Amino acid sequence: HQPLIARDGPHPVEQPVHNYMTKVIDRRALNAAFSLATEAIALLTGEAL
Amino acid sequence: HQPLIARDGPHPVEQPVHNYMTKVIDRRALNAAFSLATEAIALLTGEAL
């Protein structure tokens, strides 16, 4: 909500208006960081015990 | 072992890696020699008194 200043004489008279702006939200996604091998998967469960 | 980041978008997914290396020790040798004086050996060992 903007202010203004009274202005004399030959200048035209100003009047207050306002600004309401809208902005969207961007979407960002990331992915990382995991892997395994078969010799463990046999050994971590059931099979190779 | 190494740490990872969690890259986003048009790239391969970063996967965790570990690196094992084997490095071998070294053998060296030092030396010094105090050759002892002939008659003085007889003078210290006895049988010249």
Resolution (angstroms) stands at 4.5
Q: What is the DSSP letter of A46?
A: S
Contact A34, B15 (CB under 8 A): yes
Q: Which of B8, B15, B16 sits opposite A30 (nearest CB)?
A: B8
- N-terminal to C-terminal alpha carbon distance within chain B: 73
**Using the beta-carbon criterion (under 8 Å), do B6 and A34 form an inter-chain contact?**
no
Q: What is the DSSP letter of A21?
A: -
Alpha-carbon distance A24 to A1, whole Å? 22
Residue in chain B nearest A31 by alpha carbon: B6
Report DSSP letters for B4-35, one per residue.
-----SSSPPP--------------------P
Q: How many residues does chain A have?
A: 49
Backbone angles phi, psi at A34, to 5 degrees: -145, 145
Instruction: Please report the sign of the dihedral spanned by the C-alpha atoms of residue B29, residue B34, residue B35, residue B40.
Output: negative
Of B32, B22, B13, residue with least CA distance to A34: B13
Q: List chain B residues with CB under 8 Å of A26.
A: none
